[PDB]
Amino acid sequence: SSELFTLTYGALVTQLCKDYENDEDVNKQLDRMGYNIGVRLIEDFLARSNVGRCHDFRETADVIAKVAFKMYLGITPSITNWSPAGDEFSLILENNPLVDFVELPDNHSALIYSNLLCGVLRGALEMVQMAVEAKFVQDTLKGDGVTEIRMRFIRRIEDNL
Amino acid sequence: ADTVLFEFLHTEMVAELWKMSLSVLEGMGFRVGQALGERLPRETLAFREELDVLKFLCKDLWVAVFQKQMDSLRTNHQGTYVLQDNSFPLLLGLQYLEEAPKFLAFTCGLLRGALYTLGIESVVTASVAALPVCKFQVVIPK
Ligand SMILES: *C(=O)CCCCCCCCCCCCCCC
């Protein structure tokens, strides 16, 4: 009965939507919360896999898609749409990873249901000196044929010092 | 989803959704508890006395949610029960004794929500002995 995470995340979105009249405020909160979870998740991940430090953005994609996702969500997103420079790629999923159904009529058109994941991705990667942008550019819950998360390498974060 | 994910999410929820706040956390746990009970072998409790329902929560529900059974169950046989987890998972120094209540609210709802699905009305509160020992108090009015 490991549907605990899904049910719990569902209640959080429902509760944040009542606490904030504006959906943009929910997306912002979901992203910050995700970031905070992301910083913790990275430690847990490296400790359980020992994959090592990546060097290219291409290596990061294979670890995130073939190892991280499989370990935490039991799924393997596909990697496509690489930029000629290799500083951007997309994660393709059959459906929304965090949510199965949404309440109708649609009162949250601008609401990014699983925005937490994007924060998790950004927070985890920031811990490994990579400033990246994770963003849903396609979502099955939005009517799209697939769920697509675009990953963009912004810059290399300087060491703490 | 992986076990650790729930704890990560729960920790952030307590921080962000920081007594009306506890009411909110408990309220959320209540809806989740309802759905979870719904997926457990509810049928088996048909024709059973209240006592078995609470054992159900200590075993069937606690395993499903925390991958472990309750460490002990006590009762006054007058509708009140005390469930004890000697090492509660969501509790990841004496300085935190006052903060612990915040991390137990959601689970109180979880328990209350599960009881609801089984047709039982109740009030659930929690307290901490010596961290990480937690006692959940279930009160079934009658
Ligand atoms: C190379 O430098 C190794 C980097 C590995 C980064 C792993 C980041 C974890 C991705 C999290 C995805 C899990 C989904 C969890 C949903 C909340």
Side-chain angles (χ1 to χ4, degrees):
Chain A
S1 182
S2 188
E3 295 79 69
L4 183 59
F5 181 74
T6 289
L7 294 179
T8 298
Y9 183 65
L12 169 60
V13 182
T14 292
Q15 179 58 51
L16 289 180
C17 282
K18 297 176 185 174
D19 287 28
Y20 298 70
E21 172 64 308
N22 175 58
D23 287 341
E24 271 85 9
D25 298 310
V26 179
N27 297 325
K28 182 173 175 175
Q29 225 61 196
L30 288 175
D31 182 275
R32 196 188 64 253
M33 295 182 86
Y35 172 75
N36 299 327
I37 289 172
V39 172
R40 296 188 54 192
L41 199 56
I42 186 60
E43 313 179 10
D44 174 271
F45 179 69
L46 299 182
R48 302 166 54 169
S49 71
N50 268 154
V51 300
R53 281 290 172 293
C54 302
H55 291 158
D56 297 349
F57 200 45
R58 308 189 90 85
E59 170 56 3
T60 300
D62 263 61
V63 174
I64 297 173
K66 298 174 182 178
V67 188
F69 271 81
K70 184 58 175 177
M71 182 191 286
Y72 298 105
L73 299 170
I75 59 180
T76 300
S78 287
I79 305 171
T80 68
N81 302 332
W82 280 100
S83 60
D87 60 346
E88 175 187 284
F89 71 85
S90 283
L91 289 170
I92 305 298
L93 302 78
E94 309 184 65
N95 53 221
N96 196 115
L98 271 40
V99 189
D100 306 354
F101 300 83
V102 293
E103 225 81 46
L104 224 64
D106 187 359
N107 264 290
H108 310 284
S109 63
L111 171 69
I112 304 171
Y113 312 118
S114 299
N115 210 41
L116 187 113
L117 225 187
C118 293
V120 168
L121 292 169
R122 183 174 87 272
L125 289 171
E126 184 179 294
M127 289 310 108
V128 292
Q129 284 52 263
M130 289 185 255
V132 305
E133 191 208 46
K135 176 171 180 169
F136 282 89
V137 296
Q138 278 199 276
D139 186 12
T140 56
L141 285 179
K142 239 60 188 186
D144 305 312
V146 297
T147 292
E148 179 196 4
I149 305 180
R150 189 190 57 200
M151 303 289 290
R152 186 155 68 90
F153 186 83
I154 304 304
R155 66 193 298 283
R156 174 176 185 173
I157 305 177
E158 301 94 332
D159 299 341
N160 170 292
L161 182 151
Chain B
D2 186 275
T3 297
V4 306
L5 283 182
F6 174 58
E7 184 274 306
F8 292 156
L9 176 59
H10 182 265
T11 297
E12 291 317 313
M13 281 169 62
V14 64
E16 258 54 285
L17 301 173
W18 53 189
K19 289 162 186 169
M20 269 186 85
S21 302
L22 292 179
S23 172
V24 160
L25 288 167
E26 195 293 329
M28 297 173 74
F30 181 71
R31 304 189 189 83
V32 176
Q34 274 185 283
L36 287 170
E38 190 177 305
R39 295 148 208 200
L40 296 177
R42 300 186 283 164
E43 324 76 53
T44 68
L45 287 181
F47 301 133
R48 303 291 207 71
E49 269 194 351
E50 195 180 77
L51 304 179
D52 288 306
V53 181
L54 277 105
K55 292 174 184 175
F56 192 83
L57 299 181
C58 290
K59 287 166 174 287
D60 298 66
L61 180 63
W62 221 248
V63 172
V65 182
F66 301 114
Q67 299 75 49
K68 64 175 297 190
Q69 65 160 156
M70 198 66 65
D71 291 301
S72 80
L73 169 64
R74 287 159 72 82
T75 184
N76 65 359
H77 285 298
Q78 298 187 83
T80 290
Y81 309 80
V82 179
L83 325 204
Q84 192 179 305
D85 188 318
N86 295 329
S87 182
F88 195 53
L90 305 187
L91 281 191
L92 53 124
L94 295 167
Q95 60 272 29
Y96 295 119
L97 279 182
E98 183 171 350
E99 256 65 302
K102 302 182 174 182
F103 295 80
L104 307 185
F106 186 83
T107 296
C108 284
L110 240 38
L111 282 162
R112 180 164 81 76
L115 282 168
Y116 188 76
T117 296
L118 301 178
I120 299 179
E121 284 243 294
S122 61
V123 179
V124 191
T125 65
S127 64
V128 166
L131 292 175
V133 175
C134 299
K135 304 169 186 176
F136 299 84
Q137 186 179 78
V138 179
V139 179
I140 309 180
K142 261 185 185 175

